[model samples]
Target: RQIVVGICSMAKKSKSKPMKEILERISLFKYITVVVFEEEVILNEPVENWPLCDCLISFHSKGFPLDKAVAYAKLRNPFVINDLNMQYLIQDRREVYSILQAEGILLPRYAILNRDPNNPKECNLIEGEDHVEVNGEVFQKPFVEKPVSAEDHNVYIYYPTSAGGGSQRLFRKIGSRSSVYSPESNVRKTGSYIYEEFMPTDGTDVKVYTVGPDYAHAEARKSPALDGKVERDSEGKEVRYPVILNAREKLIAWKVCLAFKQTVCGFDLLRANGQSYVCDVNGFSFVKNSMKYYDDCAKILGNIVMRELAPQFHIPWSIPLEAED
Candidate 1:
């Protein structure tokens, strides 16, 4: 008897060190085989003809065929890690904020600044030369403007004229630079955006990575708002140190894991005025360069895959297994 686990992802992600480490650990179990799907192969072959697997670890990434992946999951009905529907939902910031708010998770005050062409009176987006006003609600200085599309990571934080008005643009890491300062003060009139209140977290940003409902790891890094400098180590990777999460933060982690139906999740936490607020939620993120975290995540995931398939095998039991030395 064989238990197969399929990983549907691009070669770039599947070949990464962290993902490879996880697969290596899962393959240690007897009668278990790990299969990675190549994009070219998946494109040429039909989903039904794809290899049979007891479980599938599929998540959305750049240039990946998410529609086909979802179709395969629906057709084959393999046990999945992150829910496919939620993956699509997280691509939109409005849906992400709505879901988290409904789950009682605290979030920064936000409003969508989408202009309706048919109904012009719905939202009056007035982009002042020196400020922004949405639906007659004026936004003072120091507010943040983010694209409604989660894939667009060009978030801008506008500062007040009293504090030497300027906007800091945050973007993906490019050659050790994650953000840059620009003198542009007015909001962009080109695209729809979500305007939210700026949160001051004492110049430090908290990143929370959760493997399961009860397990979460926290890390702290310098916030991009302060000077837009990216601190790096000798290896050129961004510097981040593990931090402890308070009780409320832990509960928020559990709620997010269950609500999003994602076993592996990452989210951004902002702490201000003695409270925590969830600003962003990411899918399928793992801790970087941590052996203990790797082992724990692999052990939990392996156990889950085995337990799900135990009934068909009629094994009557599954081992709380760990990878051998």
Candidate 2:
């Protein structure tokens, strides 16, 4: 019996080295057939004309039409990975943090700089204002400013005058640069953002990538705030070394997985004073340049898709050999 696995993503992502490798590995499974619905096909074809798939691997990314993806899912009723509805919630930083907090996950002290178009005189602060007052709760300097929209990763970290006053901006990689430092400690007055207390981590950031809640791989990278230099290898990929997560950090990973209901996820972890905090959660992330991780991810995803669709065919699928003794 053959199981069809459809990938709904942009061409660039589907053609990415990691995604391409994963798809190739999945193809080796005799019972699995991988199909990718590129951006053109997704935009040009109606849902009824889309290919038939038993399992759909679709997640949000820049310029990918999630509404169209949802239409396909709703019309075709394929077993979807990383619930599409949850994808919408994760787009809002405030919503993401609220969900995590509701799940009893620890987050940095933060407040939303509300933007009200209806009210002319409320919570308005000029660009580069040193202090922000929201509902009588004042947020001082040296705080992190992040856009509420997850699609916009233009994050800023401001410094106090005592620390020589400046700001660090984080954005997508641009010619080997992912961040830059400016002498001006100005803020963006154009949009609403989440202002969070900056927690010191010795210039190190822990990024945890998970394949389901039970498995997590941790890595550490130099914080962009320090010199704004991204060390890359010969492949031009940013360098990051594997790290070990403590029990508390591991538990946080599990909770984040459950909270977001994301099968494959990546999130930024912060550890300060023996306490773990999750600063951001990204859906559908892959481990870079690890054969072991790629192999495991392929096998796990294959088994999940098979087990989910096998019953429909009235066939019993055996578990992978490695899972049993």
Candidate 3:
């Protein structure tokens, strides 16, 4: 084929820009094709030519541009970043959890309340109604409610509290959760909370960013909300640093991404009393300001494009294990 590599962006404000910018700086790709989804409904450039490239470097993110990635996966010369199956796999945490749990993977003790809210087997909608419970089994205090999507905001944790004047300490886990925020309204919205057993950590989450099965870099930090080294009112202090993933934790991250067919992604794991639990799987995670690791990843992407599609270019390093195998 005449085409070698193509850079395709589906979103205007994509998470992929940092890595994309890095790749563009690589002189090796100066002549490579760049395809962007311009115009609200279409591309300023023709869409028909995108598939001619050996690998469409799809800026995989949550957008309509992903539709082309999905479409291209069906044709020849359709290698794409992260692949198309990932878009479907990472959307629903409820389903992803089920699969991971059955595989005997280390994950939070989590369960989903059906989208119907009062889906009989799960929960009954009630709350101004913020806090109500079905049973001690799942909705226990000291637990977290994450979104069913692999990554989305609105995650909340419950740590029941007590009152004075002959009040009973019924629902909370006392110090299981700690925050200066309002307790009653924490569960304000009645939507289903993907409840999971909350594990204690040093408030730091380990991020495993993977470009391929064997090419992964890890970082440790506390997200703004979970970051509790300071007062809640003020801006959270940054405490990010690089760290190495434990052998087992690294293996699980790679396997999970592989099983889900996501090549470029990141997953977060929290450690509780020595056991590790994966709390989040973010497919196509752009992860702002992680260039320390992302630059190498960009090289890997560039190397792949040049070495295979356009063999005249030289590889700066060895291919990742899976890629070579």
Candidate 4:
């Protein structure tokens, strides 16, 4: 009669590593019985193949068995961290941005195009204010191609040096770029693709990982998603080791999470010209190389499960000391 929670996990090398660590680390919460739906055994199997657990935490970025996972979770709705609506919203960058923007969340200027990207003519000068406008909006690029719902899928950041590269070219290929792509392509075609303005990072980017609404941890890293390396400091010394988020920054990050109704996620914050713009919303984000940080996330998640499913077992939660003033 012991209650177990089903954790939908991946078996791939990239995700499996961190996920495995999370699974092991959460064992500290001995009161909970965590059952993992490992991809290796879970895939190609019937819904009945899913084990019966009291609760389910469906977290998988890769195109894992989401459809089935959702169906199985809804089979009883066992204290799910997020519903399908939240996941879908986070997946489609365009949708998430629009909704967030409407609620006053800062974001880079963006447009959507659902066309053939391979054609040379995508859209009219994204970085330029010149050319004519059929939609009567001044838009230009320096932006890249980021999937609204895809992870580890290559992304174009619009910066020449970024390994992520510029989407102006890739968009032209997916047969998905034709609207507001980039320069030198000679804009004549238009339609298909969500184009976003490039946020000036001065070669640095900040990531604030959030678990539900109460806790967040931040860190600064290199701007070269184009290159998987971290950027150096102002004096050109010391790599950008992860740091915690300050109080103000912490509040902002958590508010954004709450606004989006995303209990488990991360946001990319870039401060430029005295303004903070949230450039990306990562679904169920986990910090890299920091088991302590992972524990932070696990603790927050455990708190959520306790508060929602077993308040009598709940404990007081507070901000991580690293984020204090």
Evaluated with TM-score, which candidate comes out highest?
A: 1
lDDT of each: 0.84, 0.82, 0.57, 0.60
TM-score of 4: 0.74
Instruction: Kindly list the per-residue Cα lDDT of model 2 for residues 20-70, writing each as its tens digit.
Output: 888899899777899998678887888788888989988888887889888
Model 4 stretches astray by more than 4 angstroms? 13-15, 116-134, 140-191, 225-239, 243-248, 311-325
Candidate closer to the true structure by TM-score (higher is better), 2 or 3:
2
TM-score-sorted candidate list, best first: 1, 2, 4, 3
Residue pairs of candidate 2 with colliding backbone atoms: none
After aligning candidate 3 to the native by TM-score, how far in Å is the CA of 127 from where it should be?
10
Estimate the Cα RMSD of every predicted model relative to the unseen true structure.
Answer: 2.9, 2.6, 6.8, 6.7
Instruction: Name the runs in model 3 displaced over 4 angstroms.
Output: 1-3, 13-17, 25-51, 59-62, 75-77, 117-136, 162-180, 185-189, 223-239, 290-292, 306-325
Backbone clashes, each candidate: 0, 0, 3, 26
As a whole number from 0 to 100, the lDDT of residue 50 in candidate 2 is 80
Q: If scored against the real structure, what TM-score would every candidate get?
A: 0.93, 0.92, 0.73, 0.74
- Candidate 3, residues 84-152, lDDT tens digits: the string is 656676777877776677667888866555546555434543322224343334344555766665545
**Number of the top lDDT candidate:** 1
Order of candidates by lDDT, top first? 1, 2, 4, 3
Give per-residue lDDT, candidate 2, residue 311. 81
**Model 3 whole-model lDDT (C-alpha atoms):** 0.57
lDDT tens string, model 4, 200-227?
6665678787776667777776555334
